[PDB]
């Protein structure tokens, strides 16, 4: 069974890293890149960017532990912790070279330690629409003039007794298009039809309970990257953020310079949070102009 | 049917104001003290304190509109439209003489264009628990190092799409002991009973509704309250706050002292939000004092 349909050319498989078994979508020939989606969605983010990326690369794709078609982690959902499952994933196909790496949400938080820790082995970077946790998260606000702000889902997501699981169970498809519109500048990208795809997935009980355990392992993240990130990125890095309604704009950039010594980033006009799907064309030719330099 | 037990001496009654029927419980003699709840909670919040004033004031708590056993204003959510109703009722029942008024949470919202339009209307004033609706509302952190902040709900509450009466309805019971609890530093206060009493009443569909569109015009009585503010209180007031977890601390009289030139705060050690639950005795006595001058 696919929850989403494979790419033609492409192979959805399964591969067993410590104790779990992490499915992904492969494709491709050469140099590896591996692309990892954020809240919300699964590898399938991806898949009009993979097509023409494994014109020159290998890719792999990957749902992140307890979500899509992934079994949820064996150690913790901290950054550090899942980090080595998606390392480890990554050298198992390139053992014996760098690769390049894609990270759009919570698949930054779930990346970054694997990065600095493991320095040599990643050649290029993308990282798209969202912060990576320090302490800067704790100056976002909880409301704005505007209505309701960026992040105060955190807290929600984070909160004690199960409260997002709780309320959020039998009401996930409704929910998830609120979150994910609500996010949005080209809301109109998500047709029924995808949204019915997406919350199917995440209304897996493991799948929701895994969603929010990522938030929940926020502050552990945060409390991890403080020493992690003594050392700065060598490597080359790209930043995507959607300039418009719901997307994350100059602070991106601003935040990765403090974590990387040659960085590159771009905004997005009239996009949001979304990048791939609300502005497939501009963040495609982005990325794969970053990554084939 | 009352859905909370009305002290011996007390009525509840009902009286239309602008075409809205508004509910209240009323007793004692002499100058009228007007106490107006919060979100959450109705007038039986006041219910200990009540009894106690009485001795020296007529007492009158109100359901705010839409909340408890009071109708939906006919015209709209924002504070200096709710603040309409309120002062008009107060007047049908002081209309030669100044009253007072002692309001917790988004009472404050629903009271404080009332107050500073009408000064002379108003003897003493007292406060607690709950900013002012001004820009100080858009510094609050989404997210804290230690877990789910004191005001994301904010922009839960304020989500289109009913967001919040969608997730709750079936789950009202649940969610209100949570939200209490998490604001609460005395949480054994609040019994099974109480929170079902609670549960009941804004479970009402139309109370359900009514409570989220006090923070849906939340923005609206923000730039209500900037044309408002040019003009300074007169009149001797009070803030209270509670000095443990889910309390405003310090807060509370700070930005009361931009609004008012005669101001005495207190912060309640111990004590989180529901001060009159969670610590009645001494909030009880300050307010009597404080009234009592």
């Known amino acids: 069974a696919e929850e989403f349909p494979v790419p033609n050319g492409f192979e959805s498989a399964y591969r067993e890293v410590d104790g779990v078994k992490l499915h992904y979508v492969k494709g491709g020939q050469g140099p ?41 982690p064996k150690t913790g959902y901290s950054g550090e912790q899942v980090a080595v499952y998606l390392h480890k994933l990554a050298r198992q196909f390139s053992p014996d070279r760098p ?104 209304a897996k009980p493991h799948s929701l309970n895994a969603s929010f355990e990522y938030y929940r392992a926020l502050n ?17 890095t790209m930043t995507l953020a959607g ?3 719901g997307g994350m704009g100059t602070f991106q950039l601003e935040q990765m310079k403090a974590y990387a010594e040659d960085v590159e980033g771009h905004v997005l006009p009239g996009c949001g949070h979304w990048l791939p799907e609300e502005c497939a064309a501009p963040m495609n030719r982005l990325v794969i102009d970053f990554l084939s330099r």
Chains 1, 2 share one sequence.
Do not use: C
């Open 32 to 72: 590896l890149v591996m692309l990892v989606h954020g809240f919300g969605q699964t590898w399938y983010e991806w898949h009009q960017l993979m097509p023409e990326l494994a014109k020159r690369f290998t890719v792999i794709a990957p749902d992140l532990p307890g979500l899509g078609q992934s079994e949820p």
């Open 99 to 202: 690769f390049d790496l894609v990270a759009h949400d919570i698949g930054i938080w779930n990346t970054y330690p694997m990065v600095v820790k493991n320095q040599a082995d990643i050649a290029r970077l993308v990282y798209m629409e969202a912060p990576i946790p320090d302490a800067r998260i704790y100056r976002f606000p909880a409301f704005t003039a505007q209505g309701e702000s960026l992040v105060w889902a955190f807290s929600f997501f984070a909160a004690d007794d199960r409260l997002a699981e709780t309320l959020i169970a039998g009401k996930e498809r409704f929910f998830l298009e609120h979150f994910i519109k609500s996010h949005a500048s080209n809301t109109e990208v998500f047709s029924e039809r995808l949204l019915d795809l997406y919350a199917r997935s995440y």
């Open 220 to 236: 552990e993240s945060v409390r991890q990257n403080a020493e992690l990130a003594k050392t700065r990125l060598q490597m080359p």
């Open 243 to 245: 300039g418009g309604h």
